[PDB]
Amino acid sequence: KVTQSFLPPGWEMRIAPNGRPFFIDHNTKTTTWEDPRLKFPVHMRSK
């Protein structure tokens, strides 16, 4: 699919035992998988 693996500053790409790669941002302490829509601004437009 159109979901490419990239390594952005602060993020760390690892693999979860469930078989999905996850990105953990060491800046904001966040950890999630790269969702398609997550890559685009959703919360900062949905008001």
d(CA 47, CA 45): 6
Check if the beta carbon of residue 35 is closer than 8 Å to that of residue 47.
Answer: no
Tokens in use for 46?
Answer: 């949905």
Kind and range of the H or E element at 14? strand 11-15
Check if the beta carbon of residue 10 is closer than 8 Å to that of residue 27.
Answer: yes
